[PDB]
Amino acid sequence: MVSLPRMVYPQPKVLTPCRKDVLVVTPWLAPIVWEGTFNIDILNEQFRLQNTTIGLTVFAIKKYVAFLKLFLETAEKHFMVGHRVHYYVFTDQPAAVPRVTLGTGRQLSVLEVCERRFLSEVDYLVCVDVDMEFRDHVGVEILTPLFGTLHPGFYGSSREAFTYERRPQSQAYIPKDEGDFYYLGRFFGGSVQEVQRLTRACHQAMMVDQANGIEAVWHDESHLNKYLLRHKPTKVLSPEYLWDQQLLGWPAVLRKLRFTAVP
Ligand SMILES: CCCCCCO[C@@H]1O[C@H](CO)[C@H](O)[C@H](O)[C@H]1O[C@@H]1O[C@@H](C)[C@@H](O)[C@@H](O)[C@@H]1O
Ligand SMILES: O=c1ccn([C@@H]2O[C@H](COP(=O)(O)OP(=O)(O)O)[C@@H](O)[C@H]2O)c(=O)[nH]1
Ligand SMILES: [Hg+2]
Ligand SMILES: [Hg+2]
Ligand SMILES: [Hg+2]
Ligand SMILES: [Hg+2]
């Protein structure tokens, strides 16, 4: 809405690609977020001027509650710093949630295990798993109506090799001649409306599958891939956003490892 203020930064170079080792835009013109493609100062200004609030949701059941401390502490250091953040921790052990110190303008809600609530409390929803830790910047550059994240183990793979559900009897079915990328089932998000739209579709498709006595090879991830194939994401995050250094090392194509699994 409102105008940006005067800002001093390097002029974009029309005749100089911002990364010549990777694809930075999809065939449907959605940017693929890699380090070096964005100026965070410009983006921070745009989103702060809109007083953007980001909801971060995580489920922590049973032994997984033990990962909450590191998850939240690192999120405090790297996730949407400077912006309004609302953490939503869904757990079966409310009293076991760690007492983590939060920066100003950030809050945490513990939900024991109300979709309308999201619509009134946050502008965007980011859905991830708890057994992870932030190691570098994860900010507003990811915000968009709907985004998926390139799976770290298959970003360089051909579609035939993707572990999509291959049985036609499943709602998540994707033939060998279809598919753009293999997205992570544990790092996606977008506007509340778009995220609820995706989860609602996934929930229904999985019910149809169980009624037909079939379970997708990679469960929710298989369905998320089917959804994003038919509903193109408006932004796609590079593997920088969900990496496993123990299993994959640190490739030259990765300038930053922002969010990683905890061994
Ligand atoms: C061919 C080499 C691929 C190496 C990555 C395998 O990752 C797993 O991929 C499947 C789909 O085929 C699922 O997405 C599964 O959750 C992935 O494993 C998990 O994520 C990877 C990155 C690693 O952190 C594993 O320890 C996790 O269990
Ligand atoms: O036997 C299992 C293993 C995992 N999960 C759930 O799946 C989520 C993600 O799984 P996992 O930790 O196995 O992820 P990965 O190793 O794929 O990173 C967890 O938060 C759990 O809620 C589960 O219900 N049963
Ligand atoms: Hg979510
Ligand atoms: Hg789906
Ligand atoms: Hg689902
Ligand atoms: Hg899904």
**Alpha-carbon dihedral sign for residues 44, 47, 51, 54:** negative
Structure tokens at 257: 């490892």
Task: Round to whole Å and give the CA distance between 20 and 259.
Answer: 24
On whether the CB atoms of residues 229 and 174 are closer than 8 A, the answer is: yes
Residue nearest to atom 18 of ligand 1 (CA): 153
- Which of 61, 129, 184, 246 best tests ligand 2's pocket when mutated (most atoms within 8 Å of CB)? 129
DSSP annotation of 234 reads: S
DSSP annotation of 212 reads: T
Residue nearest to atom 6 of ligand 1 (CA): 153
Q: Which atom of ligand 2 is nearest to the CA of 130?
A: 20
- Which of 133, 154, 243 best tests ligand 1's pocket when mutated (most atoms within 8 Å of CB)? 154
On whether the CB atoms of residues 41 and 23 are closer than 8 A, the answer is: no
Write phi, then psi, for 27 (nearest 5 degrees).
Answer: -65, -15
Q: Is 237 helix (H, G, I), strand (E, B) or coil?
A: strand
Class of 1-263 per CATH? alpha beta
Between the alpha carbon of residue 119 and those of residues 67, 84, 93, 116, 147, the distances in Å are 28, 15, 26, 5, 18
Structure tokens at 27: 């065939």
On whether the CB atoms of residues 111 and 89 are closer than 8 A, the answer is: yes
Domain ranges of the chain: 1-263
Structure tokens at 244: 């496993």
- Is residue 161 within 6 Å of ligand 1 at its C-beta? no
Task: Round to whole Å and give the CA distance between 41 and 161.
Answer: 38
Long-range interactions of 205-212: CB distance < 8 A, separation 24+:
205/171, 205/172, 206/171, 208/171, 209/170, 209/171, 209/172, 212/169, 212/170
Long-range interactions of 40-43: CB distance < 8 A, separation 24+:
40/137, 40/139, 40/140, 40/141, 41/7, 41/9, 42/4, 42/7, 42/9, 43/139, 43/140, 43/141
Structure tokens at 255: 């300038």
List the beta bridge partners of residue 107.
86
What separation in Å is there between the alpha carbon of 237 and the centre of ligand 1?
Answer: 17
Residue nearest to atom 3 of ligand 2 (CA): 64
- Is residue 90 within 6 Å of ligand 2 at its C-beta? no
- Would you give the distance in Å from CA 188 to the centre of its chain? 3
Structure tokens at 142: 């990811």
List the beta bridge partners of residue 125.
55, 190
Residue nearest to atom 13 of ligand 2 (CA): 131
The answer to whether 89 is annotated as binding is no
Write phi, then psi, for 31 (nearest 5 degrees).
Answer: -70, 150
**Alpha-carbon dihedral sign for residues 185, 186, 190, 195:** positive
Torsion of CA 33, 152, 132, 45, to 10 degrees: 0
On whether the CB atoms of residues 164 and 174 are closer than 8 A, the answer is: yes
- Of 122, 123, 143, the closest CA to residue 241 belongs to 143
What separation in Å is there between the alpha carbon of 192 and the centre of ligand 5?
Answer: 16
Nearest listed ligand to the Cα of residue 210: 5
- Would you give the distance in Å from CA 163 to the centre of its chain? 19
Q: ∠ CA 224-225-228 to the nearest 5 degrees? A: 85
Task: Round to whole Å and give the CA distance between 189 and 236.
Answer: 10
- Is residue 59 within 6 Å of ligand 2 at its C-beta? yes
Question: Is residue 221 flagged as an active site residue?
Answer: yes
Task: Round to whole Å and give the CA distance between 172 and 225.
Answer: 8
- Is residue 163 within 6 Å of ligand 1 at its C-beta? yes
Task: Write down the H helix ranges in the chain.
Answer: 40-48, 68-78, 115-121, 192-211, 220-230, 245-248
